[PDB]
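To close the section, here is one more complete example, presented without commentary so you can practise reading it yourself. The ligand is zinc ion.
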Amino acid sequence: ATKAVAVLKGDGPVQGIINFEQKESNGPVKVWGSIKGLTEGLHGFHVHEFGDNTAGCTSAGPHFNPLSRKHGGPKDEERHVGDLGNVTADKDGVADVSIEDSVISLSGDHSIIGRTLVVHEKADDLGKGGNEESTKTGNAGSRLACGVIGIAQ
Amino acid sequence: ATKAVAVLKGDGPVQGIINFEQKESNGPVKVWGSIKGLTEGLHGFHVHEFGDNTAGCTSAGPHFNPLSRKHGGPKDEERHVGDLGNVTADKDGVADVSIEDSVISLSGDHSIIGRTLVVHEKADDLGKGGNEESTKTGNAGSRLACGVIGIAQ
Ligand SMILES: [Cu+]
Ligand SMILES: [Cu+]
Ligand SMILES: [Zn+2]
Ligand SMILES: [Zn+2]
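Output:
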């Protein structure tokens, strides 16, 4: 492995198309991507525990990451194992993602392949809710659409 | 892991909800479940290598298996790896899947978690179609709908 993509879907217009590429195993994974079909503003963007989708973008789980610290993101140290957090969709629903992370592993041990990328309706609290949800998905609301990665190359 | 799924979809009516269970990491991966939404008769069913779905069930790799031999099936020895043969849909558009991939494993070395499942428009010739496509994907034709393997246990 070296390049990974997840295509997200659920609502229909909301089609996500992430690109997690590791230039090397010693390179941070640049977790870039291009969702379209959403409404404006920041949206829920995270990892979730299970890759599973049997219930329809739900069974996937809450953010039951092993290093259970606090729901945060690239804004926190406490971040779960792939809280991108809050990424902004244009008026067109076009959310460009271009962040890089030195925590996850495309392949290795963590093998962040059979995970469920979820696009949520709302922005997360990035932990600040001070609610049970706040330490889990923040306050992102439901999973609108979701996708499994599956490696690219 | 021990339990994984693959939710296939593309068209909308057509969706699979396949359950991959390996009792151990070295037991048979019994891949069971069903695709609902098909039309009657035999249909495309394989395990494509790349997760990649960026183009829409198109780019996922025309069976880029390691044991590059022939597109075959449980009819042939020379089968790529996850050439299921053919899944046959009832009149209701319900095709049962219930096979043991008594070959590969979800985790360990073979680690098929991540691979992409595709339901096709037409039946597989299983190599003996006599076209490049017979030997590549079984002449099974248009990849109506597809899904990516994700862990559930
Ligand atoms: Cu999420
Ligand atoms: Cu296929
Ligand atoms: Zn989180
Ligand atoms: Zn094949």
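Once you have examined the tokens, check your reading against these statements. Chain B touches chain A at residues 1, 4-5, 7, 9, 17, 19, 50-54, 56, 111, 113-116, 147-152 (CB under 8 Å). The pocket of copper (I) ion (ligand 2) is lined by residues B 44, 46, 48, 118, 120, 137 (CB under 6 Å).
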